[PDB]
Each structure stands twice: as C-alpha cells, then as structure tokens.
C-alpha cells in the first residue's frame, strides 16, 4: 500500500491508503489525484538514480510531462476556471476513511471557486454518491 | 467520515519548477534553492532599445540553460542580456501576455518584466505549485 510521509503533507505526519484503493490510478483516467502520485514517484526516481545534477534537468521534466500527466484534464480545469465554474486547484483533496474498519477511498480534489474553498454542503450530493459506491463495495 | 489532506509541493524543489503568487502585480518562478524569475507588472521602463537577441544569448555559452528555458517556452507560447544577466520586458499582444501571466497564476499596467533574483520566502498566502508550468509546457 502506497504511503505518504510527513515531508509531503501539511499538518499531517503519516496518512496513507491501501494498495487496492491506489489500484484505480491506472484504470480510470478522470481522477485528479493520480497525477500527483506520478509526479512524486518521478521525483523520487530522479533524485535517487540520476546523481549530482548540473543545475536542474529541464529536458527531463519537459519529456516526462508528455509521459506522466493528463494534459487534457489540466486544460479542462483551466477552461472551467476562465469560464467561472467551480474548478480544481491541485492542493486540497477530500476522501472517506470509515474509521470503524480502516478501508478508505481515493481522494477527489476539492472544488475552488471565486478564491474560496466552497463548503461541504455545496457538493454534499457527490459525497453521498461515493458513499453509495462503498455500499456497492460492501459486498 | 470525511477528512481533508493538503500536499506540500516543496518536496519537488528539485526536478520540478515551482511557482506561487505574492500580489496581483508580482509573480515568482523558482528553480532549485538559489535562483528564480520575477514576473512584475509595472509602469516603469528599464531598457530603451527595441532589439531582443536570443540566439546570441544561447551562443554566448556563459549562461544557465535552466533559467532561460522557461523564458524560451514562455516566448513560444525587447531584451538586454549584456554581462550575463537576464532581463526581458513586454510593453503594452496584450491579450496573449496577460493570458499567459494568468495561466502562471493558477488592467492599467504598461509593462511586464522578467528578471533574475535570489530565492526568498516571497509568496505570502499562495503555496508553491507546479501546475502552472505543466500547463504552459
């Protein structure tokens, strides 16, 4: 199970998920979060293997962009922002944890609009839908 | 139950550029832990000559590729480089430059200035994030 450390989290120390939840990151291509995981893995591999960089590697990241991230989703978020609809900022992610057991869910990024993180009521319906998903996951 | 998590992008300080905003007239892009570019909205002219030489800059070979690759890809999507410094200005074409600048950050101003600076804890509220450069690239 992929885990997140305290150096890549704010106000958190060790908050991490199951492998079966992260398994959705190579099947569905409408998730806003898996791009961050891919960037983190690329960063770890680059700083580990390629040693002693000579003042940054601009071409390496220029070429990894075409291979790791979803440019269509980034352009979709940009178009949504310039057209004044709640969009994504790539910094806040919400999920469910089911504290009784421990099984969790893949986060969906928060909705930002007008420079204010709109509250849980304004998208609460989505919450319920995902809950139904875990209902379908109860069996 | 619902929980929220926020990601610290400064772990990408190497191998990825980072950007964050300070005021509506100032923006900062950062490469490494010592060098970055200031994107400043202003109504003050710094250079006069109307000739930007960029091929000569790369032919100089006394420069840093990482610093000016970003301004190159900004130009793709006047200048004065004497002495090795970096200084680009766009005078006010306006729609494109403002759209690119707003793309980084994700009127009554005459100039936008790109210049070299040393890293400081500049941006107050907006945390660094690499999404802007991934969008421009």
């Amino acid at each position, epitope marked *: 199970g992929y885990c997140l450390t*305290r*150096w890549m989290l*704010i*106000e958190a*120390e060790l908050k991490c998920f199951g492998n079966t939840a992260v398994a959705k990151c190579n099947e569905k291509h409408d998730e806003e979060f898996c791009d961050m995981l891919r960037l983190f893995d690329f960063n770890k591999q680059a700083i580990r293997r390629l040693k002693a960089p000579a003042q940054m590697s601009i071409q390496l990241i220029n070429k990894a962009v075409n291979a790791l991230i979803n440019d269509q989703l980034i352009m979709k978020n940009h178009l949504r922002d310039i057209m004044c609809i709640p969009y994504c900022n790539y910094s806040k992610y919400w999920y469910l944890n089911h504290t009784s057991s421990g099984r969790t869910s893949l986060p969906k990024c928060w909705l930002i609009s007008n420079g204010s993180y709109l509250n849980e009521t304004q998208f609460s319906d989505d919450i319920e839908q995902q809950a139904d998903n875990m209902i379908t996951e109860m069996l | 139950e619902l929980q929220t998590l926020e990601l*610290n992008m*400064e772990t990408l300080n190497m191998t990825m550029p980072l950007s964050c905003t300070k005021n509506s007239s100032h923006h900062y892009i950062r490469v490494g*832990n*010592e060098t970055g570019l200031e994107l400043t909205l202003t109504n003050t002219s710094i250079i006069n000559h109307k000739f930007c030489n960029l091929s000569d800059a790369h032919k100089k070979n006394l420069y840093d590729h990482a610093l000016m690759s970003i301004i190159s890809t900004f130009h793709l999507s006047s200048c004065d480089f004497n002495g090795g410094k970096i200084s680009v200005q766009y005078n006010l074409v306006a729609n494109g430059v403002l759209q690119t600048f707003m793309r980084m950050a994700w009127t009554s101003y005459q100039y936008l200035i790109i210049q070299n*600076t*040393t*890293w*400081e*804890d500049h941006c107050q509220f907006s945390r660094p994030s690499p999404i802007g450069y991934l969008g421009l690239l």
Partner: antibody, heavy 119, light 105 residues
Framework: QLQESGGGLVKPGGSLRLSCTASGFNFNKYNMNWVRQAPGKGLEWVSSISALSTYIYYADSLKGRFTVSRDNAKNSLFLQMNSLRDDDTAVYYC??????????????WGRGTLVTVSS | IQMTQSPSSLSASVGDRVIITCRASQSISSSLNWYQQKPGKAPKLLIYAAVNLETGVPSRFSGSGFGTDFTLAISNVQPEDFATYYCQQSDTRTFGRGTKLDVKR
C-alpha cells in the same frame, strides 16, 4: 568561518555597531541572524535578515531599537544598537540560517563578541 | 508560542541513556531544533526538523516527537557529551531555558 567584532564597553544611553564578516561561502544567498547570551542565562534570539535585505524580523522585547544591515560587497553584517540600557551586556553571535524541510535552521556560528554596559 | 524545557538539570553516569523533553503551547507540527553548547563556546546544531541528523554527528543522538511534545534521546553518553542543551522553535525563532548535564558520583 564567521568573524565577529565591534564589542567592548559603553555607558548607558549610548549606541554601538557590531560587524560580522563571512568567508568560505557565497554570502549573497544566505539568511543571517543575530543571537544573544546573557551571563549565566540561556540563549536569546535578537534579529534576522534575508538574502537581499528585503524581509527583516525582530524580537518583540526590544522592537524599535536595533537595526540590521548587510553590505554584500564586503560580505559584512552590521547590527546597530541604540539607547543602551543596563541589561544590554552579553555575548553576541552571528549565525548563518538555512532552509530545509520547509523550516529554518542555523548550521554555522561565529566566535562571540562581548558587550558591557556599566557606569 | 511558549517553549518549556524539561528538566532543569540531570546527571548521567558514563554508559547510560537519557531523555530531554521540550513542550509548547501550540501544535507546531514538526519545526523544532536541538542545539548543544559547551562552556564558553558557540552553540552547535544537532537536530533540525526534530527528526533529522546533521552532517558530522554521533549516531546515538536521536530525536522524535510531533505536535506539542518533542523528545531528544542520547543513547551512549561519552566524556564529550556533558554540556547544555537548547530546544528552539524555528517558525518564530525562540530559544529555551536549558538542561545541564554532568557526571554522577
């Protein structure tokens, strides 16, 4: 290494300048700070200055009395103390701060300069 | 933000492990630095980020903690390990009082 100078003895109500000189690294890009130690007491932060003297932070117990400046031509850091009182005698250090793990830390210090105030 | 240090003093005989604690009013996440000063000498950094060890340090010097409680553990006390210690917040840059260490007889 960092070399510290300017200390001595000054009567109450006077003023003083302290110099701290850096050699062995690129002084241009580094945050700097001034730290204090009283006789028999613990350490005490005094002031902090950024790379291009753009952000300056001070301790609240003495705000409005000390001025921190740096001339990067000589790699020099000066602290001006004004209106010296009886409790302004101590040993002073200039430390080089560093930015790691989204957190500041001082990983290089000097020797120590003695400032005494007495009538 | 208050930075209370414990204890005032403690004595350790050679060949023992000791614990020194730093508490604060607010949750500062993990921003705490552990320094050691010798009598008449400029202090030297031991621990940054409350978990990390600096270049050129004995491996027994360990640090841990989070939130409002932090603790430094010294595993194998040695003759050059009798000094004074300071815990410092890095966000607001405030020092502590100090814990002294001496040989026990």
């Amino acid at each position: 290494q960092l070399q510290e100078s300017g200390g001595g003895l000054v009567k109450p109500g006077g003023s003083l300048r302290l110099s701290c000189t850096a050699s062995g690294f690129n002084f241009n890009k580094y945050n700097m700070n001034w730290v204090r130690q009283a006789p028999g007491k613990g350490l005490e932060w005094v002031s902090s200055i950024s790379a291009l003297s753009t952000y300056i932070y001070y301790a609240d117990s003495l705000k409005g009395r000390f001025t921190v400046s740096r001339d990067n031509a000589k790699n020099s850091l000066f602290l001006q103390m004004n209106s010296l009182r009886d409790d302004d005698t101590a040993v002073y250090y200039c430390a080089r701060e560093i930015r790691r793990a989204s957190t500041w830390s001082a990983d290089l210090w000097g020797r120590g300069t003695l400032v005494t105030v007495s009538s | 933000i208050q930075m209370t240090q414990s204890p005032s003093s403690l004595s350790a005989s050679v060949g023992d492990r000791v614990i020194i604690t730093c508490r604060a009013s607010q949750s500062i996440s993990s921003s705490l630095n552990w320094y050691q000063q010798k009598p008449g000498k400029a202090p030297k950094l031991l621990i940054y980020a409350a978990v990390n060890l600096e270049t050129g340090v004995p491996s027994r010097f360990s640090g841990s903690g989070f939130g409002t409680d932090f603790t430094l553990a010294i595993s194998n006390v040695q003759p050059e390990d009798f000094a004074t210690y300071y815990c410092q917040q890095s966000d607001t840059r405030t020092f502590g009082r100090g814990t002294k260490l001496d040989v026990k007889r």
